[PDB]
């Protein structure tokens, strides 16, 4: 009972054509570096173990002895070697991601599988080297771990190394030297390394669009940033093998549609369904009990939509897209609730259908994708931090069905699924070249295979924009193993280093030079054309879509046999400067593809991308403007309150810093009750000694005298925020600290203080590496970073507190790009240690209960708050509230205080305290009874 494979029904990358030419991997070794594997899975088997490189643990150990490897172990005929390079970690091993990635590369499920179709990877007859690596300490130790796994994989005979992991926005230059030399070691040995681009979209994450003022929104990190690697983006073909559900339309026909199910529905059981809108209100699920809730994708989370139907008593849920030509999204598991994602067109069909009955099928079929041929929304954009072109190539990575833990199978999306397909195509192409080009070195075949894969890759085309997807999103195009296995030509840059042209900074007139390489015995003629395109802009945001400018005339080129010729396409986009600079004031990309055809009417034979930037890329601002300078009071990750644009509350009692992510200075607010308790030596203060809290706030913000619930920005006459410290060790506004939202990566971040008289009085420790805030999510990164090394305690380089005055707090940082000038941002910081002189005597009129102070406060900095506090006990907890002064200078003291429980507590005169604070933080707190006693 031999079952058909998934590839037998769906092979979007044409792997079968290459397999018919180069085999299925028998005798070859490939390696996978991931976070953990199910090394017992049924997908790990060989058809003929006798044809393998390592036929036993003895063959594996002999190879270990020859290279000094004293670790790792044979597992079975398929998994010839497994080693855990992060065994010292305390976290448990996750087996799903690594098993899935490996299955796409070399899965070989037998016919005895429970699945409808067998999972057969690109190289099912190759042996696997599974190597675990996970973060335990830092990213340097991490890169040192997988550098060893690379070297070991090379020395154990791996022809391909697939690395379906990464860390966003990281620069290649910051990798340890061992990691860099391991990349070169594999390359010098003809071993291919394939990296996933990442699932981080652009700056802002898969839910935001980057602002047009900042074109350097790439988020590709390491190891993908290594030039030696082949970095793979993710796209969706126009069709995909999917699970199905069928209904009856109004025309009396049977229409079956794709579904993506979390948990399982009853196979071929007729389900009823009712429309429940966006699933936000309880009334939406009025007639949802017993049926399936049809919920529109909208404003609440999927977990909220699904759980709300569970309360109403539904048997399942159907969430349909709110985007046009969108992608399926894996819905969460909410208490085993069967949840299926469907397209917007299929959802609207179900919404306006008469006989609202749907039946889920057990056998999957190939159906068109709603997205059509489209790049994945999560696939990481270039460029690298160093400014290099990534990714290199695209591969299918939407809802890929592969092997998961416990001998099971599941669909996963991600560039981690795109990579192992290209890795398998690299391995087969290299085998093909071992007979097609035997006189080459292994490094020469590797360089050729990478160039052929990129050249023959079909440049994907956005049908809505009438332009090709940006090279910064798709690389050199979608991999095509048929065109790659058949290619006898390839195209490289001017210096024959890569199949991509990096032009760095360009003006309106530039030229793209490409070398066409012919390896056939006969000369060949080609027609070539360069497309000119840039970014599409929607107002203040990038659309993350191409904007075609024009295309050049088709020109001919004849390349002699076993030779190469260069072509040059002049580009002139000067007639677009005015419009493009209006949308993208700080510069814009000028990019595209030089496409090659045997004849202009035939299909694309090769394509090489070129990328230039119209401006000064390296000197683009790396730091978002301070939040104080915002016209409307909002930044990229922070929205203002339109009713009060100067409101800027602090951290409060939040646990995570998900709010208030912008460039600013931080300080601390320390109430007087805590200053008093600390100076008196109280050990336990929080929720015991005082009801007030020490809050981290932003410098230049001050609370109103009556509310205290909100802080507001105050500014000098010029406009700068009134940032002031009082360095006296009491914890109340003693320091300033730099908080940054970095639009670009930076290096050598250092803060200094100028005395505004021509002298630097203080310099902080240097923060050598700065990573951009490419998102505002705990799962990746927050939209802001607090650099504790930039904290200034108001002291000079000798340790003495600076004299009272205004100082320039200067933050310096340099972009990663080559030769970039150092950038800086300045803040005026006032230092004032002057303790306010306040009253020492007071008389209290018993009739009106008005307290009269012997003298008004005399403060150096302007008065911040002049209040009288009363601290009463509310359920054994001293609770403090405040009283503002009258207009004659007196304070009316109440005789009772209403508690939270609704009661009333009498106020004794020993409960009142006179507190005066200036805008630098200098504070005095005197008991009112002490003032009343202030008389000889
Ligand atoms: Ca202070
Ligand atoms: Na291409």
Numbering used by the authors: 97 to 1032
Tell me what the authors wrote about this structure, in their words.
To circumvent potential complexities expected when measuring substrate binding to an active enzyme, surface plasmon resonance (SPR) studies utilized the S512A active site mutant of ScpA (ScpAS512A) and recombinant His-tagged C5a peptides. The sensorgrams observed for ScpAS512A binding to immobilized rhC5a were well accounted for with global fitting of the data using a 1:1 Langmuir binding model. The analysis confirms that the substrate binds to ScpA at a single site with high affinity (KDITC = 30.8 nM). The ITC measurements also indicated that the binding of the substrate is an enthalpically driven process with a ΔH of −9.4 kcal/mol and ΔS of 2.3 cal/mol/deg. Binding of ScpA to the larger core portion of C5a (rhC5acore) was also measured by SPR. rhC5acore represents the larger N-terminal product (PN) of ScpA inactivation. Thus, the high affinity binding of rhC5acore along with the competitive binding data indicated that the bulk of substrate interactions occur at a site outside of the ScpA active site (i.e. an exosite). ScpAS512A binds to rhC5adR with a KD of 191 nM, intermediate in value between the KDs for rhC5a and rhC5acore.
The ScpA enzyme is one of two multi-domain cell envelope proteases (CEPs) produced by the Gram-positive bacterium Streptococcus pyogenes. ScpA inactivation of human C5a (hC5a) results from a single proteolytic event between residues H67 and K68, releasing the 7 C-terminal (C-ter) residues of the chemotaxin associated with receptor activation. The structure of ScpA showed that it is a subtilisin-like protease with a PA domain inserted within the catalytic domain and 3 tandemly arranged C-terminal fibronectin type III domains (Fn1-Fn3).
